[PDB]
Amino acid sequence: DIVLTQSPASLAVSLGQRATISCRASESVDNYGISSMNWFQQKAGQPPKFLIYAASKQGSGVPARFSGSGSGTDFSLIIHPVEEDDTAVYFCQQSKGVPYTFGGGTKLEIKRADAAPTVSIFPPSSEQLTSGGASVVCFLNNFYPKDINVKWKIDGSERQNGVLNSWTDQDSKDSTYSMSSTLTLTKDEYERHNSYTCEATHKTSTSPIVKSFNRNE
Amino acid sequence: EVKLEESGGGLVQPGGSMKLSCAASGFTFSDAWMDWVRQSPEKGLEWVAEIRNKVNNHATNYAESVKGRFTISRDDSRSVVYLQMNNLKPEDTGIYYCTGLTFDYWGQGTTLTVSSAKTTAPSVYPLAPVCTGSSVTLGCLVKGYFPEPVTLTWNSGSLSSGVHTFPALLLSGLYTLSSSVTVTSNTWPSQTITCNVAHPASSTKVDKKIEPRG
Amino acid sequence: PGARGLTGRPG
Numbered sequence: 001d002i003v004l005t006q007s008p009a010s011l012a013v014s015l016g017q018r019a020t021i022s023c024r025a026s027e028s029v030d031n032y033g034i035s036s037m038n039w040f041q042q043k044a045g046q047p048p049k050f051l052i053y054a055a056s057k058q059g060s061g062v063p064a065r066f067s068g069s070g071s072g073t074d075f076s077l078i079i080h081p082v083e084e085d086d087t088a089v090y091f092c093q094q095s096k097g098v099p100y101t102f103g104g105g106t107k108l109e110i111k112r113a114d115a116a117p118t119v120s121i122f123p124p125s126s127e128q129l130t131s132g133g134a135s136v137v138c139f140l141n142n143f144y145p146k147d148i149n150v151k152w153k154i155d156g157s158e159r160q161n162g163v164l165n166s167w168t169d170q171d172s173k174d175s176t177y178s179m180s181s182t183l184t185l186t187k188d189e190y191e192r193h194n195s196y197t198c199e200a201t202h203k204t205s206t207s208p209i210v211k212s213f214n215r216n217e
Numbered sequence: 218e219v220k221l222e223e224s225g226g227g228l229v230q231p232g233g234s235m236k237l238s239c240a241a242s243g244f245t246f247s248d249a250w251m252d253w254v255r256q257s258p259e260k261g262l263e264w265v266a267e268i269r270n271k272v273n274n275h276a277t278n279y280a281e282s283v284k285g286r287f288t289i290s291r292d293d294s295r296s297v298v299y300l301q302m303n304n305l306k307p308e309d310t311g312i313y314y315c316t317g318l319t320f321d322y323w324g325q326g327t328t329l330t331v332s333s334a335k336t337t338a339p340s341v342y343p344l345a346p347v348c349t350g351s352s353v354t355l356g357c358l359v360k361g362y363f364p365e366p367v368t369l370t371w372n373s374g375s376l377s378s379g380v381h382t383f384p385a386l387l388l389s390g391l392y393t394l395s396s397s398v399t400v401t402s403n404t405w406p407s408q409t410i411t412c413n414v415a416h417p418a419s420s421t422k423v424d425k426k427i428e429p430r431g
Numbered sequence: 432p433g434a435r436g437l438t439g440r441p442g
Contacts, residue, residue, distance in 0.1 A: 032441040038320065047314055047323040048262070053437040059321070091262060095319060095440050098278045100252075100264040120354040120397070122344040126430075128358070135358055137344060139397040141381055166383040166394070178381040180395045182358075184388065213347040248434045270434055318436030 002027050002094050002101055010107035018080040021106045023092035025073045035071045036095040041088045042105070044169035048091065052077065084110055087170040109146075112175040116204040117143035121211040124190065134190030136183045138198035138211065142176040145203060150181045153197040159183065191215075219243035219322045223315045226327030228336055228364050228418055229305050237300040237327060239315030246296040247271060249317045253289065253300050256326075257311035265313075266300060282308075305331045330364035330418075334390060337363045338419040343412060344395075348430040354399045355427045357412035361391045362419075369396050370413045376400070 003026040013019040029036050035055035040048040050059045052068040055075055068077050079086055087110050092103040117140035124134045140148060146167065152159045162184040167177055181198065197212040225237045237253070250273075253265040266289040267278040277289050288301040298315060312326045344356030359367055369382050382396040398410065405427075412425045433439065 034441050036441055038438045040320075047326055048320075049323070050321055050438060057437070059437060093262075093320065093438070095438055097440065098267070099280050100267075100319075102262040102264070104261055118354070118399075120356075121347060122356050123347065125342040125344060125358070128340075128342045128360075131340065133360075135342070135360065137356055137358060137395055139354060139356065139381070139395075141354070141397060141399065164386050164388065164393070166386055168381055168383060178383075178397070180381075180383040180397070182393070182395065217348045244432075250435050250439060272434070318432050318434075319439035321432060321436040321438050 001099055002029065002096065004092050004094055004101055004103040006092060006103040006106045008106060010109060012109040012111045013082045014111040015083060016081040018078060019082050019086075019108055021077045021079075021090055021108070023070075023075045023077075023103050025075070025094060028072050029094050029096040030072055031096050035075070037068070037070065037075045038093045038095060039066075039068055039077045040091045040093060042091065043088045043172070051090075079108070082108075082110060084175055085172050086110065087172055087175065109170055110175045112144055114204050115142060115144045115176055116202060117141060117148065117179075117200055117209065119198065119200050119209050119211050121196070121198045121213055123196070123213055123215070129187055129190075132187045134185040134187045136185070136190075136196050136198075138181040138200075139178070140181065140200050141178045142171075142174070143178070143202060143204075144176050146170075146177045147203065148179060149201040150179075151199040151201070151208070152181070152183050153195075153199060154193045155195045156197070219317065221315050221317055221322060221324030223313065223324045223327040226313060226329050228330050228332065230333055231306060231331055233305050233331075234301070234303050235305065235329065237302070237313055237315075237329075239298040239300075239324065241296050241298070241315070241317050244317065244322075247293045250319055251291060251298045252316045252319060253298075254314045254316055254320070254323075255309075255311040255329075256314070260308075260311070267319075268298065305329075307331050328364070328366055332364065334363055336419045337361060337391060338421040339367060339414060339416050339423070341412065341414045341423040341425050343425040343427045345427055345430055351402060352399050353402045353405055354397055355405065355410060356398070357396045357414070357425065357427075358393075359395070359414055360388075360393045362416055362421075363391050364418055365392060367392075367394065367414060367416045369394070371396075371398050372411055373413055376410065
């Protein structure tokens with residue numbers, strides 16, 4: 001099998017700038033004078049979309065800002081000028097012979113101005129409490145860059161167990177990230193404590209952003 | 218316009234069987250070489266099987282890891298490609314895409330989960346704000362389901378912008394995702410906002426309205 | 432396209 005190895009793993013480019021993504025094959029993909037190397041864009045939650053064929057030739061309807069080069073073992077995909085909708089994972093792929101193989105993908109992030117998260121806090125629902133569970137949820141929405149810290153405090157004391165953090169992929173329109181933080185408790189423990197705090201630290205401010213509720217308000 | 222629609226994905230126990238089906242239109246089907254490709258977080262994208270046109274004797278090919286187990290075939294009269302999978306392993310779990318003209322065109326895909334765990338419907342909980350500003354943010358928690366996927370929308374897809382639906386995580390062998398939505402406080406609670414959740418695997422379909430606490 | 436597709440195996 002021909003193994004394809006992409007670099008870099010991810011990459012962050014400002015709007016209107018060049019993004020260059022590479023693909024090295026373990027053996028030559030040249031055959032009958034064509035370099036059989038294809039590139040694909042996978043946007044969040046979508047199937048792969050065909051961009052480039054035969055190393056450098058462009059698929060029907062594909063914007064001119066996408067273009068590839070190379071031969072033999074070393075190939076690359078150039079995107080220029082980059083725009084907001086290009087946030088995606090890009091895969092190289094080889095059709096020289098069976099078995100057909102793909103690279104591991106490269107993540108293209110669109111750079112933008114820093115943005116502090118809009119933070120919201122949500123006690124459990126009445127329905128969830130009547131089932132015997134208690135989930136306290138925090139949304140940290142529309143922030144950049146992706147790196148962020150979320151601290152949970154019960155009555156002022158820090159809490160690390162039961163916490164689960166999920167990030168969205170970068171947004172196609174405004175280039176921000178968003179994130180859910182979910183503290184999962186037994187109802188019995190939830191009802192023991194009064195003050196529930198969600199404390200978000202981010203590049204944008206030295207001071208954390210804090211949202212809180214008290215169990216009975 | 219090219220279209221590929223896969224169907225027949227779902228849950229199966231290890232060692233079982235399943236038949237995927239791919240209905241293609243918008244191009245000369247009898248000429249197209251068709252393939253199946255799968256995607257998982259562990260393995261990434263793997264090519265699975267190929268079937269070629271009548272001129273290439275309907276030649277089949279397979280990835281080494283599926284030989285003797287998977288069988289690809291096609292009905293040129295109905296523009297359909299089949300994938301018969303036997304003796305399924307957990308490593309065969311993933312999203313299965315049907316592709317036409319080798320990899321020129323791809324379907325939306327269908328999910329295959331190979332596990333002993335049983336189908337479990339989600340519990341769907343509304344999340345209203347704390348009992349002030351310009352916009353306001355609402356939420357919807359979807360907890361304790363298996364297998365993937367669920368689909369979540371707000372007002373049946375009417376409310377698209379200002380929505381963040383977070384990837385599912387595996388909370389001790391059962392999946393949990395949330396979704397947020399942000400609208401102007403003129404909108405809510407003046408208008409009804411409903412979280413719509415579907416879980417094909419268990420025939421679950423739930424609509425939770427979001428309501429104030431006080 | 433071809434039969435094989437733009438993405439396919441070389442002739």
